[PDB]
Structure formats: C-alpha cells, structure tokens
Amino acid sequence: EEECVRLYIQWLKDGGPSSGRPPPC
C-alpha cells in the first residue's frame, strides 16, 4: 500500500541509481 514508493520502486525496478534517473521519491 504505497503511493510514492510505487512510483519510486518503478525507478528501483528500472535500475535505481543505475537507471539514469534519480528516485521520484
């Protein structure tokens, strides 16, 4: 049950730090 995390972990799935992006949360 997350809102920010969900968006975040999306990032975290992509690669986190290593996705090119920084975290949305």
Side-chain angles (χ1 to χ4, degrees):
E1 309 315 87
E2 64 289 85
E3 162 176 274
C4 226
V5 162
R6 240 179 183 192
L7 298 208
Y8 171 73
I9 290 181
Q10 209 316 267
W11 182 72
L12 291 297
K13 275 97 148 65
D14 200 276
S18 305
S19 65
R21 350 185 188 207
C25 298

PDB file of all heavy atoms in Angstrom:
ATOM      1  N   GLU A   1       0.841  -1.217   0.000  1.00  0.00           N
ATOM      2  CA  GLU A   1       0.000   0.000   0.000  1.00  0.00           C
ATOM      3  C   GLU A   1       0.865   1.252   0.000  1.00  0.00           C
ATOM      4  O   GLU A   1       1.006   1.933   1.017  1.00  0.00           O
ATOM      5  CB  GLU A   1      -0.933   0.008   1.216  1.00  0.00           C
ATOM      6  CG  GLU A   1      -1.729  -1.274   1.381  1.00  0.00           C
ATOM      7  CD  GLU A   1      -2.321  -1.755   0.075  1.00  0.00           C
ATOM      8  OE1 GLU A   1      -1.624  -2.486  -0.654  1.00  0.00           O
ATOM      9  OE2 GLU A   1      -3.477  -1.406  -0.230  1.00  0.00           O
ATOM     10  N   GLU A   2       1.458   1.539  -1.144  1.00  0.00           N
ATOM     11  CA  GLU A   2       2.288   2.716  -1.301  1.00  0.00           C
ATOM     12  C   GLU A   2       1.749   3.588  -2.423  1.00  0.00           C
ATOM     13  O   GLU A   2       1.012   3.121  -3.292  1.00  0.00           O
ATOM     14  CB  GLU A   2       3.739   2.341  -1.630  1.00  0.00           C
ATOM     15  CG  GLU A   2       3.909   1.623  -2.966  1.00  0.00           C
ATOM     16  CD  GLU A   2       3.373   0.202  -2.968  1.00  0.00           C
ATOM     17  OE1 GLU A   2       2.165   0.011  -3.199  1.00  0.00           O
ATOM     18  OE2 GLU A   2       4.167  -0.731  -2.729  1.00  0.00           O
ATOM     19  N   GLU A   3       2.115   4.855  -2.394  1.00  0.00           N
ATOM     20  CA  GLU A   3       1.826   5.756  -3.476  1.00  0.00           C
ATOM     21  C   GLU A   3       3.134   6.268  -4.063  1.00  0.00           C
ATOM     22  O   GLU A   3       3.393   6.130  -5.257  1.00  0.00           O
ATOM     23  CB  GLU A   3       0.967   6.905  -2.966  1.00  0.00           C
ATOM     24  CG  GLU A   3       0.963   8.097  -3.889  1.00  0.00           C
ATOM     25  CD  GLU A   3       0.041   9.196  -3.415  1.00  0.00           C
ATOM     26  OE1 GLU A   3      -1.165   9.148  -3.738  1.00  0.00           O
ATOM     27  OE2 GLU A   3       0.511  10.111  -2.707  1.00  0.00           O
ATOM     28  N   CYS A   4       3.972   6.824  -3.201  1.00  0.00           N
ATOM     29  CA  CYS A   4       5.260   7.350  -3.617  1.00  0.00           C
ATOM     30  C   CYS A   4       6.200   6.213  -3.987  1.00  0.00           C
ATOM     31  O   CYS A   4       6.859   6.249  -5.022  1.00  0.00           O
ATOM     32  CB  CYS A   4       5.881   8.175  -2.495  1.00  0.00           C
ATOM     33  SG  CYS A   4       6.555   9.770  -3.050  1.00  0.00           S
ATOM     34  N   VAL A   5       6.235   5.197  -3.135  1.00  0.00           N
ATOM     35  CA  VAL A   5       7.076   4.033  -3.330  1.00  0.00           C
ATOM     36  C   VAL A   5       6.808   3.368  -4.623  1.00  0.00           C
ATOM     37  O   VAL A   5       7.709   2.935  -5.294  1.00  0.00           O
ATOM     38  CB  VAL A   5       6.828   3.032  -2.230  1.00  0.00           C
ATOM     39  CG1 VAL A   5       7.308   1.671  -2.562  1.00  0.00           C
ATOM     40  CG2 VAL A   5       7.501   3.504  -1.038  1.00  0.00           C
ATOM     41  N   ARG A   6       5.565   3.246  -4.943  1.00  0.00           N
ATOM     42  CA  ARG A   6       5.178   2.614  -6.140  1.00  0.00           C
ATOM     43  C   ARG A   6       5.847   3.269  -7.342  1.00  0.00           C
ATOM     44  O   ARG A   6       6.384   2.601  -8.227  1.00  0.00           O
ATOM     45  CB  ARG A   6       3.687   2.730  -6.210  1.00  0.00           C
ATOM     46  CG  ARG A   6       3.020   1.404  -6.249  1.00  0.00           C
ATOM     47  CD  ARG A   6       1.505   1.508  -6.289  1.00  0.00           C
ATOM     48  NE  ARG A   6       0.875   0.191  -6.247  1.00  0.00           N
ATOM     49  CZ  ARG A   6      -0.411  -0.031  -6.504  1.00  0.00           C
ATOM     50  NH1 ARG A   6      -1.213   0.975  -6.837  1.00  0.00           N
ATOM     51  NH2 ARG A   6      -0.894  -1.262  -6.428  1.00  0.00           N
ATOM     52  N   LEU A   7       5.811   4.587  -7.339  1.00  0.00           N
ATOM     53  CA  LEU A   7       6.461   5.396  -8.355  1.00  0.00           C
ATOM     54  C   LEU A   7       7.951   5.286  -8.238  1.00  0.00           C
ATOM     55  O   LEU A   7       8.671   5.180  -9.229  1.00  0.00           O
ATOM     56  CB  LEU A   7       6.031   6.842  -8.161  1.00  0.00           C
ATOM     57  CG  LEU A   7       4.526   7.062  -8.318  1.00  0.00           C
ATOM     58  CD1 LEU A   7       4.226   8.471  -8.788  1.00  0.00           C
ATOM     59  CD2 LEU A   7       3.919   6.010  -9.244  1.00  0.00           C
ATOM     60  N   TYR A   8       8.389   5.325  -7.009  1.00  0.00           N
ATOM     61  CA  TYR A   8       9.762   5.128  -6.671  1.00  0.00           C
ATOM     62  C   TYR A   8      10.217   3.809  -7.195  1.00  0.00           C
ATOM     63  O   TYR A   8      10.962   3.783  -8.126  1.00  0.00           O
ATOM     64  CB  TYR A   8       9.898   5.269  -5.165  1.00  0.00           C
ATOM     65  CG  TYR A   8      11.217   4.894  -4.593  1.00  0.00           C
ATOM     66  CD1 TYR A   8      12.303   5.711  -4.782  1.00  0.00           C
ATOM     67  CD2 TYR A   8      11.375   3.733  -3.851  1.00  0.00           C
ATOM     68  CE1 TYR A   8      13.519   5.399  -4.252  1.00  0.00           C
ATOM     69  CE2 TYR A   8      12.585   3.397  -3.317  1.00  0.00           C
ATOM     70  CZ  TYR A   8      13.669   4.235  -3.514  1.00  0.00           C
ATOM     71  OH  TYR A   8      14.893   3.919  -2.969  1.00  0.00           O
ATOM     72  N   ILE A   9       9.726   2.733  -6.661  1.00  0.00           N
ATOM     73  CA  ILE A   9      10.200   1.425  -6.980  1.00  0.00           C
ATOM     74  C   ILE A   9      10.140   1.112  -8.437  1.00  0.00           C
ATOM     75  O   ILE A   9      10.905   0.318  -8.932  1.00  0.00           O
ATOM     76  CB  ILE A   9       9.436   0.445  -6.165  1.00  0.00           C
ATOM     77  CG1 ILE A   9       9.880   0.640  -4.772  1.00  0.00           C
ATOM     78  CG2 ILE A   9       9.696  -0.959  -6.591  1.00  0.00           C
ATOM     79  CD1 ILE A   9       9.207  -0.303  -3.833  1.00  0.00           C
ATOM     80  N   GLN A  10       9.250   1.748  -9.113  1.00  0.00           N
ATOM     81  CA  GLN A  10       9.271   1.741 -10.552  1.00  0.00           C
ATOM     82  C   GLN A  10      10.685   2.126 -11.056  1.00  0.00           C
ATOM     83  O   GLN A  10      11.311   1.417 -11.847  1.00  0.00           O
ATOM     84  CB  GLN A  10       8.178   2.700 -11.029  1.00  0.00           C
ATOM     85  CG  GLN A  10       7.582   2.333 -12.359  1.00  0.00           C
ATOM     86  CD  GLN A  10       8.645   1.949 -13.349  1.00  0.00           C
ATOM     87  OE1 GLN A  10       9.138   2.775 -14.120  1.00  0.00           O
ATOM     88  NE2 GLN A  10       9.029   0.689 -13.308  1.00  0.00           N
ATOM     89  N   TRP A  11      11.158   3.224 -10.538  1.00  0.00           N
ATOM     90  CA  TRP A  11      12.568   3.666 -10.655  1.00  0.00           C
ATOM     91  C   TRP A  11      13.511   2.550 -10.203  1.00  0.00           C
ATOM     92  O   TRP A  11      14.529   2.277 -10.841  1.00  0.00           O
ATOM     93  CB  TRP A  11      12.819   4.890  -9.742  1.00  0.00           C
ATOM     94  CG  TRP A  11      14.173   5.483  -9.780  1.00  0.00           C
ATOM     95  CD1 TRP A  11      14.736   6.209 -10.757  1.00  0.00           C
ATOM     96  CD2 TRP A  11      15.101   5.459  -8.716  1.00  0.00           C
ATOM     97  NE1 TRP A  11      16.005   6.568 -10.384  1.00  0.00           N
ATOM     98  CE2 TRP A  11      16.244   6.124  -9.124  1.00  0.00           C
ATOM     99  CE3 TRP A  11      15.060   4.911  -7.467  1.00  0.00           C
ATOM    100  CZ2 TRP A  11      17.362   6.257  -8.301  1.00  0.00           C
ATOM    101  CZ3 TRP A  11      16.146   5.035  -6.633  1.00  0.00           C
ATOM    102  CH2 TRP A  11      17.298   5.710  -7.062  1.00  0.00           C
ATOM    103  N   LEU A  12      13.147   1.900  -9.097  1.00  0.00           N
ATOM    104  CA  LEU A  12      14.000   0.938  -8.449  1.00  0.00           C
ATOM    105  C   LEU A  12      14.081  -0.305  -9.310  1.00  0.00           C
ATOM    106  O   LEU A  12      15.102  -0.991  -9.354  1.00  0.00           O
ATOM    107  CB  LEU A  12      13.474   0.617  -7.028  1.00  0.00           C
ATOM    108  CG  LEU A  12      13.598   1.749  -6.005  1.00  0.00           C
ATOM    109  CD1 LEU A  12      15.016   2.135  -5.739  1.00  0.00           C
ATOM    110  CD2 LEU A  12      12.904   2.958  -6.436  1.00  0.00           C
ATOM    111  N   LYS A  13      12.989  -0.575 -10.009  1.00  0.00           N
ATOM    112  CA  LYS A  13      12.964  -1.640 -10.989  1.00  0.00           C
ATOM    113  C   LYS A  13      13.820  -1.293 -12.200  1.00  0.00           C
ATOM    114  O   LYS A  13      14.565  -2.129 -12.708  1.00  0.00           O
ATOM    115  CB  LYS A  13      11.547  -1.961 -11.467  1.00  0.00           C
ATOM    116  CG  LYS A  13      10.795  -2.930 -10.578  1.00  0.00           C
ATOM    117  CD  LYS A  13       9.885  -2.209  -9.620  1.00  0.00           C
ATOM    118  CE  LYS A  13       8.633  -3.010  -9.313  1.00  0.00           C
ATOM    119  NZ  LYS A  13       8.934  -4.269  -8.582  1.00  0.00           N
ATOM    120  N   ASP A  14      13.687  -0.052 -12.661  1.00  0.00           N
ATOM    121  CA  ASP A  14      14.390   0.411 -13.856  1.00  0.00           C
ATOM    122  C   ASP A  14      15.896   0.266 -13.684  1.00  0.00           C
ATOM    123  O   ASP A  14      16.610  -0.073 -14.627  1.00  0.00           O
ATOM    124  CB  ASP A  14      14.045   1.878 -14.144  1.00  0.00           C
ATOM    125  CG  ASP A  14      14.319   2.277 -15.583  1.00  0.00           C
ATOM    126  OD1 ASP A  14      15.472   2.615 -15.912  1.00  0.00           O
ATOM    127  OD2 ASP A  14      13.368   2.275 -16.392  1.00  0.00           O
ATOM    128  N   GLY A  15      16.371   0.497 -12.469  1.00  0.00           N
ATOM    129  CA  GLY A  15      17.792   0.410 -12.208  1.00  0.00           C
ATOM    130  C   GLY A  15      18.194   1.156 -10.965  1.00  0.00           C
ATOM    131  O   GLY A  15      19.363   1.144 -10.573  1.00  0.00           O
ATOM    132  N   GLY A  16      17.219   1.785 -10.330  1.00  0.00           N
ATOM    133  CA  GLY A  16      17.501   2.709  -9.276  1.00  0.00           C
ATOM    134  C   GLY A  16      18.461   3.773  -9.754  1.00  0.00           C
ATOM    135  O   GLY A  16      18.266   4.357 -10.815  1.00  0.00           O
ATOM    136  N   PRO A  17      19.504   4.028  -8.984  1.00  0.00           N
ATOM    137  CA  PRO A  17      20.597   4.924  -9.364  1.00  0.00           C
ATOM    138  C   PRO A  17      21.085   4.651 -10.775  1.00  0.00           C
ATOM    139  O   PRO A  17      21.374   5.560 -11.553  1.00  0.00           O
ATOM    140  CB  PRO A  17      21.692   4.520  -8.389  1.00  0.00           C
ATOM    141  CG  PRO A  17      20.968   4.078  -7.168  1.00  0.00           C
ATOM    142  CD  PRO A  17      19.692   3.455  -7.651  1.00  0.00           C
ATOM    143  N   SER A  18      21.138   3.373 -11.089  1.00  0.00           N
ATOM    144  CA  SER A  18      21.714   2.898 -12.319  1.00  0.00           C
ATOM    145  C   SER A  18      20.677   2.836 -13.440  1.00  0.00           C
ATOM    146  O   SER A  18      20.822   2.073 -14.396  1.00  0.00           O
ATOM    147  CB  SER A  18      22.310   1.525 -12.053  1.00  0.00           C
ATOM    148  OG  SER A  18      23.232   1.574 -10.974  1.00  0.00           O
ATOM    149  N   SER A  19      19.624   3.629 -13.316  1.00  0.00           N
ATOM    150  CA  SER A  19      18.618   3.703 -14.358  1.00  0.00           C
ATOM    151  C   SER A  19      18.830   4.956 -15.204  1.00  0.00           C
ATOM    152  O   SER A  19      18.187   5.145 -16.236  1.00  0.00           O
ATOM    153  CB  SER A  19      17.216   3.721 -13.750  1.00  0.00           C
ATOM    154  OG  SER A  19      17.002   4.893 -12.982  1.00  0.00           O
ATOM    155  N   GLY A  20      19.738   5.813 -14.748  1.00  0.00           N
ATOM    156  CA  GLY A  20      19.949   7.093 -15.396  1.00  0.00           C
ATOM    157  C   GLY A  20      19.173   8.192 -14.703  1.00  0.00           C
ATOM    158  O   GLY A  20      19.604   9.342 -14.654  1.00  0.00           O
ATOM    159  N   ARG A  21      18.022   7.823 -14.164  1.00  0.00           N
ATOM    160  CA  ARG A  21      17.181   8.742 -13.420  1.00  0.00           C
ATOM    161  C   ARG A  21      17.537   8.676 -11.947  1.00  0.00           C
ATOM    162  O   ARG A  21      18.115   7.686 -11.500  1.00  0.00           O
ATOM    163  CB  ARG A  21      15.705   8.355 -13.564  1.00  0.00           C
ATOM    164  CG  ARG A  21      15.425   7.288 -14.606  1.00  0.00           C
ATOM    165  CD  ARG A  21      13.932   7.052 -14.765  1.00  0.00           C
ATOM    166  NE  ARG A  21      13.637   5.897 -15.617  1.00  0.00           N
ATOM    167  CZ  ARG A  21      12.518   5.767 -16.333  1.00  0.00           C
ATOM    168  NH1 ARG A  21      11.615   6.742 -16.345  1.00  0.00           N
ATOM    169  NH2 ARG A  21      12.298   4.657 -17.030  1.00  0.00           N
ATOM    170  N   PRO A  22      17.249   9.729 -11.175  1.00  0.00           N
ATOM    171  CA  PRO A  22      17.158   9.633  -9.731  1.00  0.00           C
ATOM    172  C   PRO A  22      15.727   9.354  -9.279  1.00  0.00           C
ATOM    173  O   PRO A  22      14.775   9.504 -10.046  1.00  0.00           O
ATOM    174  CB  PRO A  22      17.612  10.998  -9.236  1.00  0.00           C
ATOM    175  CG  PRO A  22      17.757  11.857 -10.465  1.00  0.00           C
ATOM    176  CD  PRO A  22      17.095  11.113 -11.602  1.00  0.00           C
ATOM    177  N   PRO A  23      15.577   8.956  -8.017  1.00  0.00           N
ATOM    178  CA  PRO A  23      14.327   8.421  -7.488  1.00  0.00           C
ATOM    179  C   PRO A  23      13.237   9.473  -7.345  1.00  0.00           C
ATOM    180  O   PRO A  23      13.485  10.595  -6.894  1.00  0.00           O
ATOM    181  CB  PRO A  23      14.764   7.839  -6.143  1.00  0.00           C
ATOM    182  CG  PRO A  23      15.897   8.707  -5.733  1.00  0.00           C
ATOM    183  CD  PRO A  23      16.630   9.003  -6.999  1.00  0.00           C
ATOM    184  N   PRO A  24      12.006   9.096  -7.726  1.00  0.00           N
ATOM    185  CA  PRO A  24      10.857  10.006  -7.773  1.00  0.00           C
ATOM    186  C   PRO A  24      10.335  10.317  -6.386  1.00  0.00           C
ATOM    187  O   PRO A  24       9.483  11.187  -6.189  1.00  0.00           O
ATOM    188  CB  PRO A  24       9.834   9.216  -8.604  1.00  0.00           C
ATOM    189  CG  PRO A  24      10.148   7.802  -8.338  1.00  0.00           C
ATOM    190  CD  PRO A  24      11.639   7.730  -8.133  1.00  0.00           C
ATOM    191  N   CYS A  25      10.879   9.594  -5.436  1.00  0.00           N
ATOM    192  CA  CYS A  25      10.556   9.759  -4.034  1.00  0.00           C
ATOM    193  C   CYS A  25      11.774   9.449  -3.175  1.00  0.00           C
ATOM    194  O   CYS A  25      12.525  10.393  -2.845  1.00  0.00           O
ATOM    195  CB  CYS A  25       9.384   8.857  -3.648  1.00  0.00           C
ATOM    196  SG  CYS A  25       7.835   9.240  -4.529  1.00  0.00           S
TER     197      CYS A  25
END
